[PDB]
């Protein structure tokens, strides 16, 4: 499950399925916990969908990488760093990137419709 | 480079959530109606803090709620809040119990237009003089009789994370409750904690792998307690030697009061035995690892200064209040601790509730392990005293190695990849 | 040769009834309830509103009744007081009231089953019914429950918020009269901060009209309906109970206490409210002008005294005041003040129910509050209007009239020129 | 959120990420509110999926438009009307259209299964 | 070379146990305020051709669900009601001797007592009439020792109405339409339904009232027919009409016992006093019993002798009638010997303090009902036990009264996902 | 398609039909799945959880959004050494499910592995 947490990003990316399978599965507090797990799951799926990555664990987009977000080389990011470190580092850009991902997909989706029409 | 998006990423943050209870007419067995894995994280360094650990606060919410629920649908003893006509038990005392037991008679309800005269025995701790006496707690709150069919015996229970959460466990044998920990593993549930409720001495807990581990929020702060975990147990065995009976009295429509009946055989004082050498070695070990925080100096153990000053515990079905003054006595084949027994119990340091513990028939003998001490501190010399109260420290001592984290399996990174 | 195309996220909605939750601006019963801590203009949307057929009012009413009962549910009952009382009048230091205060002694329980005590307390005349031999009112229908003295019923702003998938539309038309189309509609998440103030006849501490006095009704020609009048400027009313009260706490059982009114220090004086006179005369002149627009160009309008409905009936400092408004509603329209005397009660049969009753512990000291009159409830060849009301839903309609709940239904189809393949 | 509600259909179609990302997020009233939001969300996402539009905000289909449902041309529909107006104009034909979309997908899936057999 | 292909929406299922919800039709009834979901006026049923499904009445969880729901509603409806604890006092009782016929001698008592009132410092002298079965000249109510008595609220109706048990999403109820179905076994005519037919939650012993009828013939069903430890349920082919009455014209004496606390006592009888009774058509009963015998003879031997014999709530026929509780003597029905080759009147007793499901401390006090009571009902089945052979009218386990209606239904879970091989490969 | 609009068989109508016929009614079965106080909330929460668990599983195999999904895992003769004509023309889904019940964990594991490899391969090609 989380064994990959101690590995670099370039290795951990090969063990995504094992984590995805474990996101699902008085007494009110336990019922609330179950409802929350469902809401969190769906929210993450909604974001992948709205960004055009529904159904994928790994996807690529058309938003270019901004050196402001990170100035590291791939040989540092994927080979000499883990995901916990990467997440701590990109803390001021998460919302920016997510907004850009939604904008890009909205433009791509309209372009697809216009192409299908011709 | 292009933005790439990954889902299923092994990342987490500290979090506070609802945990569920699992178990491998007991109240925890009934409550924890969930049946009962570990993964090592090779290069994960994580930061733990047992003094700010929400799992502790959760046990002190769950244990109390369960306790109160279990006692709710039971016979209330409000009808016993009368003035009692009461004298001393003088037969078969053979000293050290003089005035300890009372023999009380009173006018009890029963049809609504009838009354009855009944009598019973009481321990003096539960009886207050107003030969006119009252039950000690009728002035503040109604006393509810615990249902005799309900067992409050602690069993191991396991705290388990809900999906999306994980419990991280610290394996550092030298971990002192705070700071970074290497050798962190992920588990789904805790190891099984017996919710033993006690003061001064921590009974039937976990042992340290080695030596003695002394933990506190701030070792130089005299306002904080010191929790000391031993790597060896001290064997202690407690007895209530009297052969007791019960007098079942109907007080209403299927409402029964279980009174102490009488004593078969001689009357004796309750007591606990501790071996001499085991205790002497144990304190010496505590001192050896304690000097490390104060300098090499005189370390004295002294007695306490009811629930806090005595060692409170539930032996069998009765609540003992034992005198540890002869245990904590040193300036650095067995000894006994005399004990008192009480039936009206005010738990969790609340005063608006009271429980009546029905008598246990027969003779009570329990054998248990001392796994840790609660000490307080208060010049080239210093004095350590048994501490107690609060009751969350009793759980911090087992939960100190665990933390709950929330998994957030979504993030981005740069890469050599574009769509189409 | 057009094809069906499916669009998701479409800005379309339908009228709906749902469950709203309460938020607040971060002890008090609502502060405990409204646990969630706390506008988009729709440029070309015309929408139809109807304050009389709204559901938000029914849900607010239900939440208030429910919360009130939950608050009293765990408090000590006063069934031990349903005994015969021996009552005489209080005669010391009485100005001129006469029969309003009585000194009642009685045989009450103690913490022991086998012991009794003799106690006495003061009661207001309106809470005591004669059989010197008296009993408390009720004790035939309903049991009396003492309100917990530590629990506050001070109204605080309540914000009703839509659940996900729903939205609240707000009407901004400055003269909106409660029904029909509104051309200035915006979308909000929460319904502003509304205080659950309870009163009848005169509505206190509500919203003001922005341009003029606005008169709203379900049917302006139906005399059986109430007329809700919203003022554009507030009228200040200063209310007080001048007597210096004390309180005696009597143990009645094992951890159970009753709070009794003790001796009053100083003179016994009448509770009253001071309404500014000039402001009141200007206020009615504005109301009348707006009424003439509906009742006739040459119709003479007169105000008159009404026939716990005929009184103001409000909660001030935690005490319940029943003020005589006949001092205000008496005129013909074609530094001075108006003093309204007020009666005080301790046993309250709230929300027009009789199976439940609350006892309000007395409050020590002297009580004064200052409130804003923001609206009136009136009931209907000259015309005469009288104060009316008593149905609590009509108070809440005055704050929720501009809000509507709709359900978002973000899925639909339309023709276009693309094919899937 | 609904800011595009008064705009024409041809304008409002570009604001579909909004009111997509905003649709999912005494006692049990809050659980009922949470559960309802989830159940409604899923009924709509699963309906798009059964029609073969999972993961898309705008999808083209193989079902032709019948002039009976609406005899207006594209210029009127996309440039003069808004979405509330359109919804009213074809409200009584919605169920027919939805049934046809499901039928169409069922046929497409079987046809793809056969082509993948070659 | 075949490949795995995944199919979602596959029409398969597994047996399952779940919680069903209650629906009712478009009607202060205890069921009406519970079965809040309106049923469809034109409900759906789907016939499944070529589906054989094994049904088993004694493993049917729907019965346990219904039994549980019944207890829950009956206990819940008594929570917000006046308790009668203040009546557990000594009473001064004498016999009622006013216009009593021989069949009623000793049945009614006239009891006076010192009751509580509105104020705690006052008491009142009141009196009421009681039935013999409800009392122990110094009397106590029959059940004040290890019990509490709660008065049922007079506004609440316990009249049975049709109840429909409906499946939650993901589940379905399968129904067996085989006219000859006898339980525990395969059924070849299976349909899926949204929910059950309406079932009336009639509570009775010995004779089953107002249930379904067999389509063609009397059906004898049991878990194991040769086992004397098991009951035999008999579903009748035609109904037998029974007319029950409580002929005495009663009144209601309302006593205020506290602050809105009312006790409803039985007042004096107007007119004379007669025994309650039921009229069973005689010719129908004889023919009906003969039909049962012909079917019993398909078991236990073709040429044997079958006898019927008789065996409070078990030995008599217990039922509710108009809100009143009747205990009728059925020895007048189960009295015959069968060999190869106008009405019956059953006297009835009335009891006011009720212990409905083999429980001791939870007793209900039925308020008296004003006027005269008459019920007309259908006997739709019998409960028999077995000792030439002898059968008797046993009963008392309420599950059998529901098992007899729910016998044709089974709950399954739909599991719409699976795989199969085919000639298809993903590119 | 004819007259007013499309018509469909009822829920489980195809349950006794053979697999080759029943596979054409997947949209019926997959449509009808979309639907004290604590008991009803538990019933509703459970229906959602069960539904999502199945959708999650289809997604991890790369089958999200499809009722019929072809994969890259070959069929083993040891799971079932049978002819396709028998499987699709002379057997129902209930019968098939009974026969293949000890292999579903095996099959699901294989499907999860195949999809993980395919997504990595797609990223590597997009990178060119
Ligand atoms: C620490 O753990 C030990 C077990 O390793 C606990 O000892 C056990 O305590 C229970 C309750 O006092 C005893 O149960 C009773 O046994 C008698 C028979 O002697 C039976 O009649 C009663 O109905 C009940 O089952 C149990 O026998 C005893 N086990 C042993 C081996 O002696 C000890 O109580 C724990 N310490 C604390 C403080 O709880
Ligand atoms: C209309 O709004 C005004 C405020 O603008 C309300 O007046 C305020 O009411 C509260 C609660 O009764 C008063 O608080 C209390 O003050 C006393 C001191 O006199 C203190 O001992 C208590 O602990 C508490 O803090 C507040 O002082 C008072 N403000 C003013 C200016 O008088 C008024 O009650 C509202 N009207 C209605 C009908 O609710
Ligand atoms: C079997 O089904 C029959 C027919 O539905 C039931 O008989 C009916 O029972 C109800 C309730 O006891 C009777 O209603 C009452 O009628 C009186 C008439 O004056 C009225 O004052 C009451 O307010 C109430 O409406 C109904 O008349 C009666 N029908 C017949 C033909 O007698 C029977 O009770 C059911 N048996 C069992 C055991 O459930
Ligand atoms: C139930 O089973 C029978 C066979 O026992 C099925 O009958 C076949 O139906 C098809 C329909 O196209 C015909 O072409 C075959 O010739 C029939 N077979 C025989 C032996 O007659 C029947 O269709 C099945 N029922 C359902 C609903 O599928
Ligand atoms: C942890 O770091 C060591 C450094 O030598 C490396 O060999 C090992 O593979 C790493 N562990 C994991 C899980 O990647
Ligand atoms: C992101 O890239 C754009 C490219 O135009 C640049 O203007 C912007 O400043 C960059 N973001 C930050 C925070 O530097
Ligand atoms: C953004 O960067 C600054 C400087 O490193 C840091 O203090 C701040 O906490 C960062 N923001 C977040 C969200 O971590
Ligand atoms: C019971 O009450 C009577 C009243 O006269 C008293 O004499 C007697 O001593 C009381 N008995 C007890 C045990 O309190
Ligand atoms: C525990 O160890 C940390 C290591 O940094 C130290 O700062 C802290 O004071 C220690 N606390 C105790 C009670 O030993
Ligand atoms: C009880 O404690 C004494 C302490 O000296 C020990 O020797 C003895 O073995 C203990 N009893 C049991 C059963 O272990
Ligand atoms: C209320 O009291 C304030 C105290 O400053 C005073 O200014 C105001 O005029 C009073 N209002 C009325 C209506 O008398
Ligand atoms: C005011 O109305 C009441 C009835 O509510 C009546 O008794 C009283 O006499 C009236 N007083 C005046 C001045 O009209
Ligand atoms: C609102 O309508 C006017 C025409 O009446 C148009 O010019 C304007 O652009 C519209 N606004 C929006 C937001 O679509
Ligand atoms: C087609 O578009 C033109 C645009 O000017 C409009 O006048 C005409 O009415 C439209 N016809 C239909 C069928 O919508
Ligand atoms: C009623 O009469 C019978 C004799 O017929 C007698 O046994 C019984 O004790 C009497 N009951 C009362 C209360 O007098
Ligand atoms: C009520 O109590 C008095 C007490 O003297 C007694 O004489 C009378 O008989 C009692 N009455 C009843 C009906 O129990
Ligand atoms: C009530 O008392 C009688 C004896 O007088 C006894 O036989 C009966 O069993 C008791 N009831 C209960 C429930 O124990
Ligand atoms: C069932 O009743 C019908 C008439 O309704 C009759 O013809 C048939 O013979 C009866 N069945 C049996 C087993 O007698
Ligand atoms: C019920 O039918 C099954 C069919 O297999 C049979 O085995 C069983 O003996 C029958 N029981 C009775 C009482 O008819
Ligand atoms: C059915 O009953 C007979 C006795 O009549 C017994 O021998 C047999 O074992 C029972 N059947 C089962 C499955 O136990
Ligand atoms: C029962 O009453 C009906 C009329 O309601 C009558 O037709 C029938 O014959 C009666 N049955 C008996 C057994 O008296
Ligand atoms: C059964 O009937 C016989 C007469 O045949 C009678 O003596 C006996 O008391 C009856 N028993 C019951 C419980 O009805
Ligand atoms: C019962 O007696 C009363 C006396 O007034 C009469 O009105 C009523 O009709 C009688 N009831 C019956 C069913 O005869």
Considering only CA atoms, which of B293, B393, B274 is closest in space to residue B337?
Answer: B274
Whole-number Å distance between alpha carbons of E289 and E237: 11
Compute the distance between CA of residue B331 and CA of residue C220 in angstroms, rounded to an integer: 93
**Closest to E121 measured CA to CA, from C253, C348, C131:** C131
DSSP class of residue D77?
I
Cβ atoms of B50 and B9 closer than 8 Å: no
Please count the CA atoms within 13 angstroms of the CA of E411 that sit on its side-chain side.
23
Interchain contact B69–C (C-beta under 8 A): no
Say how far apart CA F9 and CA E413 lie, in whole Å. Answer: 20
Q: Do B415 and F127 touch (CB under 8 A)?
A: yes
| Residue C169 near residue C47, CB atoms below 8 Å | yes
How deeply is C99 buried, as exposed, middle or buried, from its count of CB atoms within 10 A (0-12, 13-18, 19+)? exposed
| Closest residue by CA, ligand 19 atom 12 | E221
Q: Could you tell me which CATH class the domain C3-75+151-412 is placed in?
A: mainly beta
Residue B411 β-bridge partners: B6
d(CA E283, CA D100): 62
Q: What is the DSSP string of B332-397?
A: --EEEEEEEEESEE-GGG-SS-EEEPPPPPEEEEEEEEEEEEEEEE---EEEEEE---SSSHHHHH
Taking Cα atoms as reference points, which of C191, C81, C223 lies closest to residue C138?
Answer: C81
User: For F41, which of D31, D46, D47 is closest by C-beta distance?
Assistant: D31
Nearest to C178 by CA among C14, C391, C398, C406: C398
Alpha-helix runs per DSSP H in D1-118: 9-12, 29-50, 74, 83-89, 94-115
Q: How far is CA E128 from CA C59, E82, E110, E267, E399, in A?
A: 46, 17, 6, 6, 36
Residue in E with minimal Cα distance to D39: E169
Q: Check residue E112 and report its DSSP letter.
A: E
Candidates E240, E191, E187, E184; CA nearest to E211 is: E240
D57: left (phi over 0), alpha (psi -120 to 50) or beta: alpha
The Cα-based distances of E131 to C418, E18, E100, E266, E374 in angstroms read: 84, 44, 13, 9, 19
- Give yes or no for a contact between C204 and C373, defined as CB atoms under 8 angstroms apart: yes
Q: Are E401 and E158 a contacting pair, CB within 8 Å?
A: no
Query: What's E83's DSSP letter?
Result: B
Strand ranges (E), A5-109: 58-64
Q: Give me the phi and psi of B369, to 5 degrees please.
A: -105, 130
Secondary structure, 3-state, chain A? CCHHHHCCHHHHCCCCHHHHCCCCCCCHHHHHHHHHHHHHHHHHHHHHHHCCCCCCCEEEEEEECCCCCCCCCHHHHCCCCCHHHHHHHCCCCHHHHHHHHHHHHHHHHHHHHHHHCC
Residue B285, classified by CB atoms within 10 Å of its CB into exposed (0-12), middle (13-18) or buried (19+), is middle
CATH 2.170.40.20 fits E3-79+156-417, yes or no: yes
C-alpha–C-alpha distance, residues A58 and A10, integer Å:
12
* Nearest-angstrom CA–CA distance, F128 and F124: 7
**Minimum distance, in Å, between the CA of residue D28 and any CA atom of chain C:** 11
The DSSP bridge pattern shows strands B410-415 and B402-407 to be unpaired
Measured CA to CA, the distance from residue C406 to residue D5 in angstroms comes to: 13
CB-CB under 8 Å, A106 with D60: no
Tell me the CB-side half-sphere exposure of residue D2, using CA atoms within 13 A: 31
Closest atom of ligand 1 to B153 CA is 11
Domain residue extents for chain B: 2-73+150-411
Strand duo E317-321 + E336-338: pairing: unpaired
Contact E137, E112 (CB under 8 A): no
Which residues 6+ apart lie within 8 Å of E178 measured at CB?
A: E187, E188, E189
Strand-pair partners of E141: E135
Residue where the block lists tokens 């409720």: B197
C-alpha E143 to ligand 17 mean position (Å): 9
Would you state the torsion angle of the CA atoms of residues E98, E100, E106, E108, taken in this order, to the nearest 10 degrees?
A: -60
Determine the distance separating the centroid of ligand 16 and the alpha carbon of B112, expressed in angstroms: 14
Structure tokens at E349: 């007793």
Measured CA to CA, the distance from residue E209 to residue E213 in angstroms comes to: 11
Q: Say if strands E21-24 and E37-38 run parallel, antiparallel, or are unpaired.
A: parallel
- Resolution limit in angstroms? 3.5
Contacts of D77 (CB under 8 A, 6+ apart): C414, C415, D9, D70, D86
In what helix (H) or strand (E) does residue B61 lie, and over which residues does it extend? Answer: helix B54-71
Q: Taking the CB of residue B333, how many other CB atoms lie within 10 A of it?
A: 6
Judge whether A84 is closer than 8 Å to chain F, CB to CB: no
Residue B83 CA, ligand 8 centroid: distance in Å: 10
Q: How far is C154 from chain B (nearest CA, A)?
A: 27
**Number of separate helices (H) and strands (E) present in chain C:** 4, 33
Site of tokens 């599991």: E415
What are the beta bridge partners of residue E420?
E5
Which structure tokens are listed for E351? 């009891």
Q: Domain B2-73+150-411 adopts which CATH fold?
A: HIV Envelope Protein Gp120; Chain G (2.170.40)
Token pair in block for residue C92: 């010391």
Residues preceding gaps in chain E (C to N > 2.5 Å): 27, 136, 311, 341, 387
Pair B145, B358: CB distance under 8 Å = yes
Q: Answer whether F123 sits within 8 Å of B417, measured CB to CB.
A: yes
CA angle D118, E1, E7 (to 5 degrees): 75
Ligand nearest to the backbone CA of C306: 12
Intra-chain end-to-end CA distance of chain C, in Å: 15
Do E422 and D116 make contact, defined as CB atoms within 8 angstroms?
Answer: no
Q: How far apart are the first and last CA of chain A?
A: 48
The technique by which this structure was obtained is cryo-EM
H or E stretch at B285? helix B276-290
Query: What is the pairing mode between strands E148-151 and E362-365?
Result: parallel
Give CA–CA dist E321/C165, Å, rounded.
51
Question: How wide is the angle at C-alpha C318 spanned by C-alphas C313 and C320, nearest 5°?
Answer: 25
CA–CA gap between residue E270 and residue E368 (Å, rounded)? 14
CA distance D36 to A38: 12
Nearest CA to CA, how far is E315 from chain F (Å)? Answer: 36
Instruction: Say if residues C274 and C373 touch (Cβ distance below 8 Å).
Output: no
DSSP B73: S
Length of chain B: 420
Give the rounded distance of the alpha carbon of C136 from its chain centre.
Answer: 26
- Please give the Cα distance from C138 to C143 (Å, whole number): 7
Cα end-to-end span (Å), chain F: 45
Alpha carbons B148 and B171: distance in angstroms, whole number? 41
Contact F71 E21 (CB under 8 A): no
> D76: Cβ below 6 Å to ligand 14?
yes
CB atoms within 10 A of CB F96: 22
d(CA D91, CA D88): 5
Q: Could you give the CA distance from residue B311 to residue B198 in angstroms, rounded to a whole number? A: 7
Say which residues have a Cβ less than 8 Å from residue B329's Cβ, sequence separation at least 6.
B301, B302, B303
Rounded Cα gap, residues B287 and B332, in angstroms? 8
Closest CA to F8 of D112, C356, E9: E9
How many CA atoms, within 13 angstroms, populate the side-chain half-sphere of residue E327? 16
Task: Provide CB contacts within 8 A for E124, sequence distance 6+.
Answer: E114, E115, E116, E117
Inter-CA distances, C114 with B106, B300, B356, C254, C255, Å: 11, 53, 21, 13, 17
Q: Kindly state if the Cβ of E49 falls inside 6 Å of ligand 4.
A: yes
Tokens representing B110? 């029963």
Chains touching B (3+ CB pairs < 8 Å): A, C, E, F
List CB contacts (< 8 A) between A21 and chain F. 56, 60, 112
Sign of CA dihedral E397, E400, E403, E405: negative
CB B341 within 8 A of CB B321: yes
């Amino acid at each position: 499950f989380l064994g990959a947490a101690g590995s670099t990003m370039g290795a951990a990316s090969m063990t995504l399925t094992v984590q995805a399978r474990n996101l699902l599965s008085w007494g009110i507090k336990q019922l609330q916990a179950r409802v929350l797990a469902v809401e969190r799951y769906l929210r993450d799926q909604q974001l992948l969908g709205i960004w055009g990555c529904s159904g994928k664990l790994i996807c690529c987009t058309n938003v270019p990488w901004n050196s402001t977000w990170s100035n590291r080389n791939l040989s540092e990011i994927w080979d000499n760093m883990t995901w916990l470190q990467w997440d701590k580092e990109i803390s001021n850009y998460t919302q920016i990137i997510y907004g850009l991902l939604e904008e890009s997909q909205n433009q791509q989706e309209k372009n697809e419709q216009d192409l299908l029409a011709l | 480079l292009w933005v790439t998006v990954y889902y299923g990423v092994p990342v987490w943050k500290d979090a506070e959530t609802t945990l569920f209870c699992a178990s491998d007419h007991n109240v925890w067995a009934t409550h924890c109606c969930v049946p009962t894995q570990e993964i090592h994280l090779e290069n994960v360094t994580e930061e733990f803090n047992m003094w700010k650990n929400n799992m502790v606060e959760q046990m002190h919410t769950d244990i109390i709620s369960l306790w109160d629920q279990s006692l709710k649908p039971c016979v209330k003893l409000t009808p016993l809040c009368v003035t009692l006509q009461c004298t001393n038990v003088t037969n078969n005392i053979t000293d050290d119990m003089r005035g300890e037991l009372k023999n009380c008679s009173f006018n009890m309800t029963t049809l609504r237009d009838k009354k009855q005269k009944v009598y019973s025995l009481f321990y003096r701790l539960d009886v207050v003089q107003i030969k006119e006496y009252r039950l000690i707690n009728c002035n503040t709150s109604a006393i509810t009789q615990a249902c005799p069919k309900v067992s409050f015996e602690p069993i191991p229970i396991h705290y388990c994370a809900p999906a999306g959460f994980a419990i991280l466990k610290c394996k550092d044998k030298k971990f002192n409750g705070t700071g970074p920990c290497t050798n962190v593993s992920t588990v789904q549930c805790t190891h099984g904690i017996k919710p033993v409720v006690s003061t001064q001495l921590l009974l039937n807990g976990s042992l340290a792998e080695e030596e003695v581990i002394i933990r506190s929020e701030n070792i130089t702060n005299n306002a904080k307690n010191i929790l000391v975990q031993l790597n060896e147990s001290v064997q202690i065995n407690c007895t209530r030697p009297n052969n007791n009976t019960r007098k079942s009295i109907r007080i209403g429509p299927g409402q029964w009061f279980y009174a102490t009946g009488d004593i078969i055989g001689d009357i004796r004082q309750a007591h606990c035995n501790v071996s001499k050498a085991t205790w002497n070695e144990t304190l010496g070990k505590v001192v050896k690892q304690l000097r490390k925080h104060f300098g090499n100096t005189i370390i004295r153990f002294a007695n306490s200064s009811l629930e806090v000053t005595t060692h409170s515990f539930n032996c069998g079905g009765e609540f003992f209040y034992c005198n540890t003054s002869g245990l904590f006595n040193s300036t650095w084949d067995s000894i006994t601790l005399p004990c008192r027994i009480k039936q009206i119990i005010n738990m969790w340091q609340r005063i608006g509730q009271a429980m009546y513990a029905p008598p246990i028939q027969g003779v009570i003998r329990c054998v248990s392990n001392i796994t840790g001490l609660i000490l307080t501190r208060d010049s080239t010399t210093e004095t350590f005293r048994p501490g107690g109260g609060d009751m969350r420290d009793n759980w911090r001592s087992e939960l100190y190695k665990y933390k709950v984290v929330k998994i957030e399996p979504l993030g981005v990174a740069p890469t050599r990849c574009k769509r189409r």
